[PDB]
Design a protein around this nucleic acid. Sequence first.
RNA 1: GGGCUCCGGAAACCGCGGCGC
RNA 2: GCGCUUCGCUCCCGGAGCCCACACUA
RNA 3: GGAGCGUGCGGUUU
Lengths: 74, 53, 334
Amino acid sequence: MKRLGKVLHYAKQGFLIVRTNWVPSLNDRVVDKRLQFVGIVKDVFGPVKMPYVAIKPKVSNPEIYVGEVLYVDE
Amino acid sequence: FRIRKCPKCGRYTLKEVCPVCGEKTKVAHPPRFSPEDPYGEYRRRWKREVLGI
Amino acid sequence: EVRRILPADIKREVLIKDENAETNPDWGFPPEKRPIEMHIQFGVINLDKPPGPTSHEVVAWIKKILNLEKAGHGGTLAPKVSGVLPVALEKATRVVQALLPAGKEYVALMHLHGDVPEDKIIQVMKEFEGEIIQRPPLRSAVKRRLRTRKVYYIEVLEIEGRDVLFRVGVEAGTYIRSLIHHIGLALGVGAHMSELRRTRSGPFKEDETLITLHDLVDYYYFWKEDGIEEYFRKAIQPMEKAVEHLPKVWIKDSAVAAVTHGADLAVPGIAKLHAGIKRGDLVAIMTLKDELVALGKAMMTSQEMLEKTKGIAVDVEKVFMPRDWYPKLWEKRD
RNA sequence: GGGCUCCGGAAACCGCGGCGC
RNA sequence: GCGCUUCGCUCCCGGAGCCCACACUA
RNA sequence: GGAGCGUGCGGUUU
Ligand SMILES: [Zn+2]
């Protein structure tokens, strides 16, 4: 598990947007700064250098994450 | 539809006037065609007129 | 001067193999100088498709109305999408191939599901310029390589509140609803595609040449009924246009018949060619009258196609020109 | 034996289904 | 209620017809 | 009584 990025905001459709330096992949476990499972992925998209990871969360509370470093469990 | 063009100038826009250009903009997508083309007859009459035929 | 140049655009140098080679005017038919019927036989319509019908219906209609035996299109557009759609005719239909890999250019209306400050919109738009990701990875498939897609430019002409108007250049199979939706996700608010309209498909531009079903049909009747070619003539492009972007080689009149009869093309038959050609890539073989003969794949580098003297240099794959036009000239001596 | 062209690999329905106004 | 569900292209299988061509040096 | 681009299935008029 390496870091993923700071959460820029919550997408009105239902996704956490963490902006990134490297590319993850579909169905990677994403966690919190204390290994607290956050969600799974559905999209990376945009500049192959510095992409965007879009997260579809699976805990009921989504918006709590704005402005946090959501680490990416292997 | 919403997408528009200077006829004389070709630039695209949403506005009904050309930003820095002459005339009034037209809907970008071309008008719809039916294979029957029930009225082409008329149209061609028109067109002949407009371009000496 | 410009911000809008694709890979098709890049001007490729002519390298001359035989300085002297010259074409006898008697054989063949130079494109923009061939009888109306033959012009149709080997021609392509740069059509401004309307929204509503599917890409093929339109074709189907054209076929029907012009009384052709065959027609077809390269690169289908969704029924709601209008804009540049080239329609290939009769003996020309197969050319279409050429266009599929070729670059696209579009005009698009992006509706937003939420208010983002204007200043920050043209900023997140920017970063989508260059090598972009078009599908997520790590599956079962422990891959090499990846699904990068090239976006040549993003130009934002206008932006009122929630609606965003921008022009964009893109590589071959860049799914366009898919792109807006992604920037949507990225801005958060979410977005979709109000309208879209293709301004370019490779050599095919939104220009003096681009014709609607309406003028088309009508110019047709002007010819058939009033006996007036020019209008209907100026409506059909030659097929040679469908390759304007491609690498070309030009071949002595002697060579043509062989190729039209399906011979592969060997080094001594090349009068001149394009620089920068590499192995196994689509190439168009032209007569010195700049008419197309066939498509093949390069067997040699252009860079040395001229240094060598014997051997084969294009597996000829598609014969467009009729055998008729050029005499059999391999009636040699030894 | 090797290539290239052209003609095949069905058409006219009616019933369900799917897609869009 | 109207329209569409494929014009075509590639691949395979099967004919029929041209050809076997290193490019005639003015 | 052929596959795919592409959504198809049931019956009748070669
Ligand atoms: Zn203007």
